[PDB]
Amino acid sequence: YVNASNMYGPPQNMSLPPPQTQTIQGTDQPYQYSQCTGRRKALIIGINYIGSKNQLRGCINDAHNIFNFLTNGYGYSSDDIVILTDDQNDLVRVPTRANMIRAMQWLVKDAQPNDSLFLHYSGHGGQTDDVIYPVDFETQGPIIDDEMHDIMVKPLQQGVRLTALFDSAHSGTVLDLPYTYSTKGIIKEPNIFSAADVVMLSGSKNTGAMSHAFIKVMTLQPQQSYLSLLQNMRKELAGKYSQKPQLSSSHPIDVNLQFIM
Numbered sequence: 370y371v372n373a374s375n376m377y378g379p380p381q382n383m384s385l386p387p388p389q390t391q392t393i394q395g396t397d398q399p400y401q402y403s404q405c406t407g408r409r410k411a412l413i414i415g416i417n418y419i420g421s422k423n424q425l426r427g428c429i430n431d432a433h434n435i436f437n438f439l440t441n442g443y444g445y446s447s448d449d450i451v452i453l454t455d456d457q458n459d460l461v462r463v464p465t466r467a468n469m470i471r472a473m474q475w476l477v478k479d480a481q482p483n484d485s486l487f488l489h490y491s492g493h494g495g496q497t498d499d500v501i502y503p504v505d506f507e508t509q510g511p512i513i514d515d516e517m518h519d520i521m522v523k524p525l526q527q528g529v530r531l532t533a534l535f536d537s538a539h540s541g542t543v544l545d546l547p548y549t550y551s552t553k554g555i556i557k558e559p560n561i562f563s564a565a566d567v568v569m570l571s572g573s574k575n576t577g578a579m580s581h582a583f584i585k586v587m588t589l590q591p592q593q594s595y596l597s598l599l600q601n602m603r604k605e606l607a608g609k610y611s612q613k614p615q616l617s618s619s620h621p622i623d624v625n626l627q628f629i630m
């Protein structure tokens with residue numbers, strides 16, 4: 370619980386997530402892993418807050434990195450990606466609060482079992498609740514974890530995958546997910562729920578550390594389990610970044626299963 374590429378090996382025999390509906394002991398709450406054979410849609414948001422007193426470097430670039438990663442290896446078509454960044458010239462693609470909320474609704478609308486939805490955010494993060502900050506937050510305010518959960522998690526049918534990756538700080542509970550995993554094992558779980566398949570990656574204590582690690586690991590060694598992905602992301606980050614990656618989920622994860630999108 371090292372190979373020729375100097376990375377942590379997944380289990381010798383790694384299974385795809387099971388297609389059968391899963392259950393949680395002691396309760397009547399089913400869930401289903403997505404097979405990720407359906408529609409692939411992504412919402413990618415990168416905000417530098419250009420011109421502001423707390424302008425950031427690298428977040429727009431993080432978004433472009435994820436866009437390129439998803440379109441050039443993972444079957445996300447440009448027509449099925451909404452990318453919101455604050456340095457480009459189309460108002461409908463600026464990460465204003467209203468555009469972000471609309472895009473979040475668009476992402477999950479009519480999602481079907483075995484679809485694979487992806488969410489990426491790089492920008493300001495904070496803890497009031499964890500929150501994220503649209504470019505117009507000074508006037509419109511942030512978007513809080515409870516609302517992101519209500520928009521993007523609550524409506525999902527059994528077996529819809531949502532994979533979320535946050536490059537922002539203090540974003541560990543940003544989707545209000547009840548399970549959290551580190552490289553060392555389970556660090557949070559309910560004291561016994563969605564039936565969907567929601568998983569998220571975020572960092573806990575320039576450029577996005579999580580997208581940096583995720584893209585490099587998946588580019589060099591695309592075969593990973595949930596746990597080996599975490600371990601290899603952690604290895605890549607050690608020394609350079611102050612961040613350690615954690616995986617949160619709407620359901621218990623068999624961490625030895627293959628990570629697919």
Ligand SMILES: CC(O)(c1ccccc1)c1ccccc1
Pocket residue numbers: 454455456457458459460463504
């Ligand atoms: C991205 C853009 O600079 C912007 C607009 C609004 C807030 C922050 C940044 C823009 C886009 C279209 C038209 C005007 C300005």
